[PDB]
Paper text:
A major Barbervax component is H-gal-GP (Haemonchus galactose containing glycoprotein complex), which is highly protective in sheep vaccine trials. H-gal-GP is located in the luminal brush border of the nematode gut and digests ovine hemoglobin and albumin, major components of the Haemonchus blood meal.
The final reconstruction of H-gal-GP at 4.5 Å global resolution was extracted from approximately 60% of the particles by classification with masking of the core base region. The base has a series of channels connecting to the central cavity. Both aspartyl proteases (PEP1 and PEP2) fit well within the arch, which is not sufficiently bulky to accommodate any of the metalloproteases. The PEP1 model was docked into the map as the model for PEP2 was almost identical. Since the MEP models were all similar in tertiary structure, four copies of MEP3 were docked into the central base. A single CP was accommodated with reasonable agreement into the wing. The proposed active sites of PEP1 protrude into the central cavity of the complex whose dimensions are large enough to accommodate hemoglobin (Hb) or albumin.
Residue numbers in the entry:
A (entry chain G): 9 to 65, 70 to 86, 95 to 109, 125 to 137, 159 to 193, 203 to 211, 216 to 221, 229 to 238, ...
B (entry chain B): 176, 186 to 202, 208 to 285, 294 to 342, 352 to 360, 370 to 388, 398 to 429, 461 to 544, ...
C (entry chain A): 270 to 288, 294 to 334, 350 to 361, 374 to 393, 399 to 420
Write the structure that this text describes.
């Protein structure tokens, strides 16, 4: 678990903020980018970044591309952050607005070195039927346990055994 | 009690010199709720016009900085240059390129025109019956290109609740044209927040006076409560003015069908009743005097001397207060404005007659003064306003607040008004003041005063003793001094620049004095004189 | 309302020919308040002097159909009332019924004596 590894930061412990949106992968990519950025000084600079802003800045709520989101680099209506989500937790797509408003073995190895990352999948209805435990037949991975991988439903978390769940990740910076 | 902070505010868009297509409103809504700075909409929010049990939005055209749509008839616009200079901040703000700045100044005008030529000049803005257009984001989305995304600028909302685009004239609308907006908008924001800027630009504009007044329209009830529950015995003046007004309103009712001409039987009975079911309010709200509960009304307003942030905050409140009012239920004891402005008001949207303690005072009034006065002052203004609820505006809203065209009689009414029209139209003050425009308030000039006289008559006759000429001067009459006092209220040396920049006073006195021949007589002076006309003696509209 | 009365009376005198004796008494109010909209957005006169203004050009605002065909790479059609020629755009399959309702009654009203 990365929460026990680094308790300083409080980014991992989060959920989504978009009742009717199709940018789940984008929101997960922004959350995973903040988790990988926390490894820099072990969470010393544990701050959030425009997630929803950068997402819009697929067709927003009609497909996704984690890889593209990572290459693009180079909370629910929170006043703390400069830019926040646009979905008052059957919706419209938002435009750009840069105006601060006030190999499973190699995968686990890279996940233990860098940190959490995005995890593309088919996203079937079976997953929704699941509640807790080693569930089986987009989201981001957290860590591993006993063998299965963690993801974030079951109070945010939703672990699965190790439909292209471990298939679709790369890196960049 | 410089620029950087609000600079970030400005840099919340991008500025003039040298982008994906922004929801100009979102910018607006922000700027409104954060500064109370109306552009692309003045939007006051309250009681529905014609289904009232509720509240609503009145999204509407702005009210232009340059007073009057004067974006049509003479080219007397140097705001061009009250603009360049008052926008020269930048190359003193953060820069070092004028040609831009100029052309863009001309432009922030040229749009302005392209607005005024699409609002409704007041003449058309009588018959609210056609203002009223209930729409909900469903229908605008069908009507236009953003409303929804706007309204977040203004606490679970009532987006669905009946909103009204009073003026469904929105002229429907690019690089060199889009950002002209953001210019204009920012032109404006800074244009009336230069104060917080460095002491330099404030130039382009008494200490306690200006200050307390800013308050006097911002945290209204505060200063009110201070005044009232500070300096006088509420019970006393309130209990007087109760019966005083009541006298007026009464005899005013007596000015009814029985009195009146252009009216008719049932039109009477109704409008009569409109009075009958109509409300008072004096000084304090019904609240304001377990003495905190006012400090509940104005509760939220954080206090921290621990001014830039201050003002901005306080405006944030004044309006935020205005709108937390939105989603609760509609009353009919609305206190429009801060009970220290010396004027009544009567919001025919709902129906109400509130008068401010701040008027329960000098020349408008006093406790132990001759009654000629306490009818010419508090008395007058009482009536002076009350009239409205029979103007060609009052007719619209019923007794209870709705649209049923209360009264045919109309034709009579308008025709008779045309007398008033010409009257003001042929007697110039300066060297004019065309009448057709100000008709309405002009009529009330008469109505109120007419009543307040007829009352004072009645009252004094009931005793028959007050006459008792005045010590400072025997010469005058227990009666004349009435007119003298009324026409003393408006004693106002309007300096002449201000005169050329309601109606102009000297007119109001002279004219509306003509038309009450009762005067012409009771002031001893021969008739055939340029205060009193012959047989068409008086545009007897009351 | 005189305009009203006359409108309904035109389409009435029309109703002589059959080649529903009340609904006219609605179509009337329709086209009337249509007048009212047109006017209440159109431009009154005096303000028709800023030739400076009424010149903004447009070539090839939204709701348009060729419609030039119905008159007979064109130059820039110039539109003398951004205000007006917008206001049509906010005023547009049901529409056809009361909107064509108007153009008839108008065209009719043209040559009554004939």
């Amino acid at each position: 678990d990365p929460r026990l590894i680094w308790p300083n930061c409080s980014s991992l412990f989060t959920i989504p903020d978009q009742a009717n949106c199709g940018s789940c992968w984008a929101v997960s990519t922004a959350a995973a980018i903040s988790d990988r950025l926390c490894i820099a000084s072990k969470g010393e600079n544990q701050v959030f970044i425009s997630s929803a802003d950068i997402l819009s800045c697929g067709f927003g709520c009609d497909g996704g591309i984690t890889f593209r989101a990572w290459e693009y680099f180079a909370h629910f209506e929170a006043p703390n952050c400069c830019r926040p989500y646009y979905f008052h937790p059957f919706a419209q797509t938002p435009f750009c607005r840069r105006k601060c408003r006030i190999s499973v073995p190699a995968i686990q190895r890279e996940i233990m070195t860098k940190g959490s990352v995005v995890g593309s999948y088919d996203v079937f209805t079976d997953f929704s039927h699941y509640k807790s435990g080693i569930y089986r037949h987009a989201v981001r991975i957290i860590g591993w346990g006993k063998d299965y991988w963690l993801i974030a439903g079951e109070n945010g978390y939703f672990r699965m055994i190790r439909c292209g769940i471990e298939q679709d990740i790369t890196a960049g910076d | 009690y410089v620029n950087e902070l609000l600079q970030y505010i400005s840099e919340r868009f991008g500025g003039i010199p040298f982008k994906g297509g922004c929801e100009l409103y979102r910018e607006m809504g922000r700027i409104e709720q954060q500064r109370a700075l109306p552009t692309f909409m003045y939007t006051w929010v309250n009681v529905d016009h014609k289904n009232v049990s509720r509240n609503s939005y009145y999204i509407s055209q702005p009210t232009l900085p340059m007073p009057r749509e004067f974006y049509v008839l003479p080219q007397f616009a140097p705001e061009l240059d009250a603009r360049t200079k008052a926008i020269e901040n930048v190359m003193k703000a953060f820069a070092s390129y004028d040609k831009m700045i100029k052309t863009a100044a001309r432009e922030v005008t040229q749009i302005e025109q392209k607005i005024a030529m699409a609002s409704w000049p007041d003449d058309e803005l009588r018959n609210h019956e056609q203002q009223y257009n209930p729409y909900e984001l469903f229908a605008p989305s069908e009507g236009k290109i953003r409303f929804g995304k706007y309204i977040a600028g203004l606490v679970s909302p009532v987006f669905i609740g009946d909103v009204i685009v009073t003026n469904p004239a929105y002229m429907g609308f690019i690089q060199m044209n889009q950002y002209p907006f953001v210019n204009y908008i920012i032109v404006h924001m800074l244009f009336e927040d230069a104060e917080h800027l460095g002491d330099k630009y404030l130039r382009i504009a008494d200490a306690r006076m200006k200050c307390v007044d800013t308050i006097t329209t911002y945290m209204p009830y505060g200063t009110g409560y201070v005044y009232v529950n500070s300096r006088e015995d509420r019970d006393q003046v309130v209990e007087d003015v109760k019966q005083q007004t009541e006298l007026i309103m009464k005899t005013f009712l007596k000015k009814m069908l029985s009195t009146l001409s252009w009216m008719q039987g049932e039109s009477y009975r109704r409008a009569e009743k409109k009075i009958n079911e109509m409300h008072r309010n004096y000084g304090w709200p019904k609240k304001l005097f377990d003495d905190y509960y006012s400090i509940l009304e104005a509760y939220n307003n954080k206090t921290d001397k621990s001014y830039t942030i201050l003002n901005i905050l306080r405006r944030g409140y004044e309006n935020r207060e205005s709108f937390r009012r939105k989603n609760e239920t509609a009353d009919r004891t609305n206190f429009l404005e801060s009970p220290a402005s010396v004027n009544a008001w009567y919001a025919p949207e709902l129906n109400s007659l509130t008068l401010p303690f701040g008027i329960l005072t000098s020349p408008h009034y006093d406790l132990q003064f001759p009654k000629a006065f306490n009818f010419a002052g508090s008395g007058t203004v009482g009536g002076h306003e009350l009239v409205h609820g029979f103007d060609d505006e009052g007719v619209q809203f019923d007794y209870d607040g709705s649209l049923a065209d209360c009264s045919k009689g109309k034709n009579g009414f308008k025709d008779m008004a045309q007398c008033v029209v010409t009257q003001y139209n042929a007697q110039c003050c300066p060297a004019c003041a065309n009448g057709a425009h100000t008709q309405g308030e002009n009529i009330a000039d008469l109505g109120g005063l007419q009543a307040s006289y007829n009352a004072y008559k009645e009252y004094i006759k009931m005793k028959g003793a007050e006459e008792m000429r005045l010590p400072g001067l025997e010469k005058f009459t227990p009666n004349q001094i009435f007119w003298i006092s009324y026409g003393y209220s408006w004693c106002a040396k309007e300096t002449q620049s201000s005169l050329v920049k309601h109606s102009p006073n000297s007119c109001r006195v002279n004219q509306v004095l003509q038309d009450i021949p009762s005067f012409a007589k009771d002031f001893q002076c021969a008739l055939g004189q340029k205060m009193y006309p012959p047989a068409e003696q008086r545009c007897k509209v009351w | 309302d005189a305009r009203t009365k006359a409108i309904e009376n035109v389409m009435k005198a029309f109703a002589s020919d059959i080649l529903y004796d009340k609904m006219i008494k609605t179509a009337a109010r329709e086209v009337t308040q249509i007048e009212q909209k047109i006017a209440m957005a159109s431009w009154p006169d005096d303000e028709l002097r800023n030739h400076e203004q009424q010149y903004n050009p447009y070539e090839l605002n939204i709701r348009f159909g060729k419609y030039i065909a119905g008159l007979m790479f064109i130059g820039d059609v110039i539109v003398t009332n951004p205000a007006y020629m917008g206001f049509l755009n906010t005023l547009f399959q049901m529409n056809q019924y009361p909107f064509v309702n108007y153009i008839i009654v108008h065209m009719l009203f043209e040559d009554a004596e004939h």
